[PDB]
Write a protein that binds this ligand. Sequence first.
Ligand SMILES: c1cnc2c(c1)ccc1cccnc12
Length: 330
Amino acid sequence: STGSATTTPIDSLDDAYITPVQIGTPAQTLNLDFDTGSSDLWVFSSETTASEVDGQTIYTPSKSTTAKLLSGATWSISYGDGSSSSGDVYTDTVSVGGLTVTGQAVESAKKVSSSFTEDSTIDGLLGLAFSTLNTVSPTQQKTFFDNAKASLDSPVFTADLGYHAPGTYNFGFIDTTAYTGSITYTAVSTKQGFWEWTSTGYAVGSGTFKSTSIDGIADTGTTLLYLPATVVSAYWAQVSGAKSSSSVGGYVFPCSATLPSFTFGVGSARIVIPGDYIDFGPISTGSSSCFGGIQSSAGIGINIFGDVALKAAFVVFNGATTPTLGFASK
Ligand SMILES: c1cnc2c(c1)ccc1cccnc12
């Protein structure tokens, strides 16, 4: 079997991407944030605290004839950005672009933190990191990818995020028309539950390539590219007027600037992020100071190859016996 679904940026900045997901019987379509940095499929629901729902589409398990309460199961997650959500669990039919999983754990939110409520475009998350990070207690649950894997034509999923445009998430196959050149595969460590790999270095604009090992995670659920301070300082040193701002909480730069590109290494291959991908607009409405798309990972503890990096490439999340990551230009 295969699945194919269009992913769409939630706003003019590509702050996040939403993909329609069918849940239950009859189908209840919710737009979820496919996140390769977490392993919980959670949704806004009829059980979510009323004051914490503001515009989101909710899943109502009582209206689904295939929904079954997972007795005694609860979930509670806290994300790297300080957001959090928790609630109870149901098992139900979940479909992504033609691909169907019966008995998938659908985590129904009872409580969500402010950032989730404030984002009316995101109805929940669909985790695609390793099932070892799933928060369901006392019985840990599997991800949608893990549940579909045995049924897929090939045990893979691909991320093809667009820059200010729609993209695609494919399950079970590699679309050879969606990229240029060839796909370079690289080693993955699953020890932290993430799609964690090692980049072979970087370049800033037309600059000379620096061979240096950068350990980080391929994370579709993170907007920006978080890299070591030395690397991020080398990047922003090429932008006239760019500075690290403690009040804004990152590198900011004149909105009038034209940004240089950023290249990252995948083995002997190179993914080039065009400069326009690194512009995240005014720091506050009407400001002439813009927020950068390349930020330091010093406060995080892990480097994150978020959407800024991933959207410049066709990305293969290979769930074979030994998982690997494939990257190709497009
Ligand atoms: C991810 C994280 N932080 C941001 C954005 C995206 C976009 C704009 C912005 C403006 C000021 C401060 N942070 C951000």
